[model samples]
Target: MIEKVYCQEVKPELDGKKVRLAGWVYTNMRVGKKIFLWIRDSTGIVQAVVAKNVVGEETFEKAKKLGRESSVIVEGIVKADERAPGGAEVHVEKLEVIQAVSEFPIPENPEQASPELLLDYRHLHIRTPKASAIMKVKETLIMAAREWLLKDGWHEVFPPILVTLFKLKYFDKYAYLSQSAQLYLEAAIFGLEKVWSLTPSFRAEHLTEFWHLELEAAWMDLWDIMKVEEELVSYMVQRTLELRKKEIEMFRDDLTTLKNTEPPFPRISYDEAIDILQSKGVNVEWGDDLGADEERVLTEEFDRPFFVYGYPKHIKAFYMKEDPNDPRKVLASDMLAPEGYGEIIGGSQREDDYDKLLNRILEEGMDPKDYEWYLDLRRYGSVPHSGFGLGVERLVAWVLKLDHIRWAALFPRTPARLYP
Candidate 1:
């Protein structure tokens, strides 16, 4: 392994200490006898000074011509400089070019380039400080979630990705990327009682693919799961705020909503949400499914994450249990993010009764034979249980205040584009 110090480690306190730095040249500026070469690594960026008299004419000329994104290794002594980045700079005694990039396609200021162009070169664009920061925050959120789940005795299980009945012939075969891990997690609940899984779920909608963080508990009801969701989400948000504050601050100027996210997030029934929307002059009706625009307006009524429960039966999935008193509605809830980011989670108490499950399947015009195994779960020994699916990208987008959900994903798989 190469012995080196990260760019961010070249602190002012490390003045006069010899350090070996390996990173890409972020910027190169020549001024007569000296060249200011800004080196960028995973941590951050630091300036390295290459003087002609110190490194000889050959090395100085080579360093002077180094373009942005060129790979290089510099052995230097740290110098405390209040004017330099991170309040310190490196004076180079030796410069080695790992790979010299003459012309990098992406500009120094990425915003100056078009979004399409940047995305087209996403393989390289992720090297930018902003993209790197966002990814770090996303990783921290997942880490925080695992910490909470483990502490709460939620067993993590790995479920299969293939879901369809048919198989392919590649000598030995398979197809159909899973749409959700809910069913598998449900099966797991019989043994583990409380189970969670993080898997990639494909879709035939706006987002072609996304990370689905799903959970199922055997003895949980609609209300019980809502509490679990709030507590879990609150932990993720607050923990990320503690660890990735610097990264998150890059995109958001205000942390008011994020800071207010805590256990027992405000709750409003679907009926109340509709009334609030209508009062705001939105043309939303009682039974209409709350789409993005409608949810955005509803989110305006809250300062932090909030739940809208008891959705109409027709608007929700067939698996949701029918509310006893309100036959028109189901025991379902969607957790909407504040400040216009809506519906980060969708949850419900599942139908545990065999007859009711069969009736709902028939009502939806789905094949009962296709769901015979699922029906058997209820036929044998079923327990009242609840679960929710959280869109990881959507949560990250909300936490980081990203304008588009696609930016939250490393290689976002939308409808049109799919490549490196």
Candidate 2:
């Protein structure tokens, strides 16, 4: 690695200190004899000033000709300036241009470029300050999740990516990418008791691919899993806020909702959620699955993340356990994010009885042969188990208040978007 100080480290406290800095030129502006080049690195960006009198004609001319996105090394003395970005500026004594680009394709302000253009150049667009900040927050969220998982004694397991049955239509005909790691995690719980896995899961919907964080445990019911979900999610949110406050603040001004995300996140049944939506003039029924629009409307009733449990049996997945008290409903729940970002997580107590599982498969018009291996567990010594699959990108998008879910993915794979 190059020996240099990061842009974020060149602070006001480091004034009068000479240091080596290396980064791309984010902006270049001249004021009389002095030229200010905003240098950006992985950490952040800081201004580097080149004065004709200080560097002499030779270096000043080189600095003045430097364009945006030019990679350079600088030896400079830090000067504390209240007006400068990050409250500090570097007075360059030596400037070494490693690679010079006459013109950078992407615009200085990303918004100036069209969304399609930006996505087309996503490899380059990720270098922008906003995108970089979003990536940092994403990293913090994952790190926080791992920390919570480790502390809570959840064993991390690796599940197969290639599986035979992805959807009911596939049956045993084709080998498709796995849609969820829940089954594998369920199998793992026999030995590990509590197991979690993070894997890329594909879907047939609009958002075709995404990171799935799934957890399954033996001896856990719907409410028990919901408790775990709240704790894990709350930890992720609070930890991200603590570590990436500056990055998060770049996108959102108010942090009240994020700060208030803690355990005991408001819980309401699917029936209650439907009523709430209906009360607010949304035309939704109890048995109907809440789409994005309906979920968004329901989110307005809560200030933080909340759960909607007891979904209709027919509407939920076939694997969900039937609620014994209410035959019409299933022991399923969805954790909805507030402020119009909904359905970050979906979970349920799985159908553990062999006969019930087989019946559900037949009821759903799915071939029981496809789930033969999955059924063997219930036939053996299957204990009550519950788990949930959380969409990694959805959580990131919701927490950062991204305009779209695709923004959270490094290279989003929607139905229409496949190439980089």
Candidate 3:
């Protein structure tokens, strides 16, 4: 029995050494008495070579019977071959067909699949080189972002996804899916001063293009939140660049060109953005939330990730602090991705004043009883805290330059499509 090793780790160092590897068959081909199979595990793919003369009747019969995506284990000598897929091939001495895949083609081929078909068979679709490579880049970005946050003395938190249901004035009944770890993090910051959480939240609105992963967070104040947002986004972008260097090179996609390569993302006031839009003949009011068209124009001008701050209080969420400089505007910001990814993150310093928060709740026609726990943050030594939620899928799409946000998330849940 040969010692087991991952298919990806088979290299020149292990050449001629017999090893056991298990994976799903990605591809299979036969030429005369020789058979070639590509086995793919989570790490990567490796070629498995089997010959009828070398393996005799039993092994040759099994190899011939094997189909694409069938589960199998092979005992083989790792041989270096210039023509092989990964510069190496597994010369099979023995084989075990653990499970046979049904005789049917995968729903979609990598070369000819549409987005809808690919999404329909997402599990199988992800096996394609482009999808696999892009997903790896997305994973690297998430890991790097979390690592930077943890290393910066921020505590990781998981808030409750199930909370008491509530109704807002315009929005329908929403069950808290804990979209952003901000509220819970804010509660902690009231005592701990500085903390952060990365978590998911839910919204009842119909899903649209460019809308995936509702990231929410509450930081101490507008100034504090702005400072952290700038620093955190810069770190995330830097970390993404560092970790995904190889993938970027392989894909030939310049993430730096799409995202701001510079440290500390550019900050533009909402008024300023509106002014720029007006200059471009876009009819946008100072108080209105930036629409998709407006966002495109802003991205065209900026050519990088930028922050738009100080939205009118009417358009802003109730939790955000009102800008002291101008009472009509809230001290909030939207982190817009370049190339029209649009609002990857939204955050602000929360209103720390108990009376003001209550007033806003009532003014927005929200029930006070439901937010008692949130209100308690103010009662217990509330400090000005700020934070934001980065939509995981949106960030992934932006970093990878993917055409759709749905491709970024595994088992994406959208209004139109829901199933395995």
Candidate 4:
């Protein structure tokens, strides 16, 4: 057994060159005294031709009997073939059946089944070309964002996941899972000017999709944060478009809308958002939070991702700074994706004033004692800082034009389903 060469990597240029290949049988085809096996690995697929005259009847017969997922190792000479998957084929000299497969659940046919069965058999379902493409695109989005953040002068930080104190004999606070590692990242910025993170954030609130990417920076106002967000998202979208041509084509997603993704993403005030909705017969009023259907309708108006800022204070989070021009509204923003993808990012300028933050905490009906450490940040050396949490799965869903957000997650944790 020589070092295993991948099926796809056996190129047309390697014709007449011998190599060893290993993978599962994608399909088995038998001709008169010859065997052709389509083998697939995670990277790609290729055809391996076994001729009885060249390899002997004994090897050809063994190749013919190989089943759906028969694990096989073959020593072969590469040959260029216009008909093969990657314009190359392997002429088998020797065949070793690592394991013979009996039955394969997935069919070669297109009538795969409805989405219901897709989730239950997600492990196997991911083997399809379309699923494989989605996973690749998902990775590109995250990897590109990581590069983008590092280039943007933000250092990565990590926070704990098992936060609920119920798991703690060592700590007191009910170690709830991280909805956002905002507090921890904020603490880190005291030492540095900027920090960001990409980690799984738990939320028992709604498991439909999880919020994950977080970034916080010092001496930046809400305006600065929104600007950075627009630039960063536009950068990531452009990067994805650049890196994922083959993958996107496999997934059959439209790349047309993404070219228009550039800075300055259109901005709308919360008041204006309500006006547009009410004008379109959405039946929304001031101070009422935008529900899913409302966001869906509002998203349809934008050609690309846009921001809706200055939410009413009572409806906003306690940490959000109160807009000086209007105390009733907080300095916050939510980024909405176009084509009815809805909100994929939310963030705000934090309240730097100690008294205001404490008052806001009290007004939100949370005890100040619980936020002793958080308050210390304000009391000691708080600067006008801003941060936002970007939903990775949500962003991926919108980027790929996926219908259901659940498909964005590898193992989607909706309210009802959690198992494989």
| Candidate 3 C-alpha error for residue 398, in Å | 0.6
The segments of candidate 4 whose C-alpha lies over 4 angstroms from its true place after superposition are 31-33, 109-111, 164-174, 206-211
Q: Which candidate is the best by lDDT?
A: 1
The per-candidate count of clashes, in order, stands at 0, 0, 12, 5
What is the TM-score (0 to 1) of candidate 1? 0.96
Task: Give all TM-scores, in the order shown.
Answer: 0.96, 0.95, 0.87, 0.93
Worst 10 residues of 4 by lDDT: 164-173
- 183-249 in candidate 3: lDDT tens per residue? 6666766445555555445555523222222223334466666666666667766777777676666
Candidate 2 TM-score versus the reference: 0.95
Off by over 4 Å in 3: 1-3, 102-108, 165-176, 206-220, 246-252
Q: What's the ranking of the predictions by lDDT, best on top?
A: 1, 2, 4, 3
Q: For residues 1-420, could you state the per-residue lDDT of candidate 2 as single tens digits?
A: 778999989999999999899999988899776899999889888999999888899888888778989999999999999999999999999999998876887898988988899899999989888988888998899999999999999999999987772454455475678999998888899999999999999987536888899999899999999999999999999999999998999889889889989989999988888889999999887678899899889999889999999999988889999999997999999999999999999999999999999999998899999899899889889899999999989998888888988888888888789879
Name model 2 segments beyond 4 Å from true. 165-173
What is the full ranking by TM-score, best candidate first? 1, 2, 4, 3
Would you list the C-alpha lDDT of every candidate in the order shown? 0.91, 0.90, 0.73, 0.84
Could you tell which candidate, 2 or 3, scores higher by lDDT?
A: 2
Worst 10 residues of 1 by lDDT: 165-174
